[PDB]
Design goal:
The chain is mostly helical. It has 2 domains: 59 residues, Herpes Virus-1; 119 residues, Bromodomain-like (Histone Acetyltransferase, Chain A, Up-down Bundle). The chain contains 7 helices and 2 strands, in the order E-E-H-H-H-H-H-H-H. Strands 1-2 form a two-stranded antiparallel ribbon. Helix 1 crosses helix 3, helix 3 packs antiparallel against helix 7 and helix 6 runs antiparallel to helix 7. The protein is globular, with a radius of gyration of 17 Å. The N and C termini lie far apart (39 Å). Bound molecules: zinc ion (ZN) (3 copies). One zinc ion (ZN) binds next to loops.
């Protein structure tokens, strides 16, 4: 197994996957690494299994169809993995905790959003459809773009949104287009 956490790339108290060489801090894994379970399989392995069990799940999908899916166990897991993929980028630190807004010439968003709030919402099963999760994720970056206006810091929002959107298209097998 790896000697650093797959998500934050630091050593520490790590839990090892039994079916692949990845390792995780307890609360870096999503969901948090389970108390017992021997063997234990990580979220990467659990997602791979879903695909292997239903090869046709990788055929192209319409985003509109994906968004209306109810959050049954498999869709719950996929949103958890997509969240984890965002945390895997070091630039997610800017969007992780609750923001505050006091900049000359800007006003804060009407509905603030951040990754830890989405993490909690997933953990507490507050989303009934994929759309709920995706809307809050996209709101994070849209709030950032609107607030930081012409400051070059706006680009961090563009960058992390691109990681989100690429991983969304991959995980939910969205039909490729030009
Ligand atoms: Zn970690
Ligand atoms: Zn694994
Ligand atoms: Zn099948």
């Amino acid at each position: 197994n790896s000697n650093i956490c797959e998500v934050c790339n630091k050593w520490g108290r790590l839990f090892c996957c039994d079916t692949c060489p990845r390792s995780f801090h307890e609360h870096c894994h999503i969901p948090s690494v389970e108390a017992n379970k021997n063997p234990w399989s990580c979220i990467f392995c659990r997602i791979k299994t879903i695909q292997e069990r239903c090869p046709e799940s990788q055929s192209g999908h319409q985003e509109s169809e994906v968004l209306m899916r109810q959050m049954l166990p498999e869709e719950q897991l996929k949103c958890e993995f997509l969240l984890l993929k965002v945390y895997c980028d070091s630039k997610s630190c800017f969007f992780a905790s609750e923001p505050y807004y006091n900049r000359e010439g800007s006003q804060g968003p009407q509905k603030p959003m951040w990754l830890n709030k989405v993490k909690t919402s997933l953990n507490e099963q507050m989303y009934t459809r994929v759309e709920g999760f995706v809307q809050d994720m996209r709101l994070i970056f849209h709030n950032h773009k609107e607030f930081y206006r012409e400051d070059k810091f706006t680009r961090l929002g563009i960058q992390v949104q691109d990681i989100f959107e690429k991983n969304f298209r991959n995980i939910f097998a969205i039909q490729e287009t030009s």
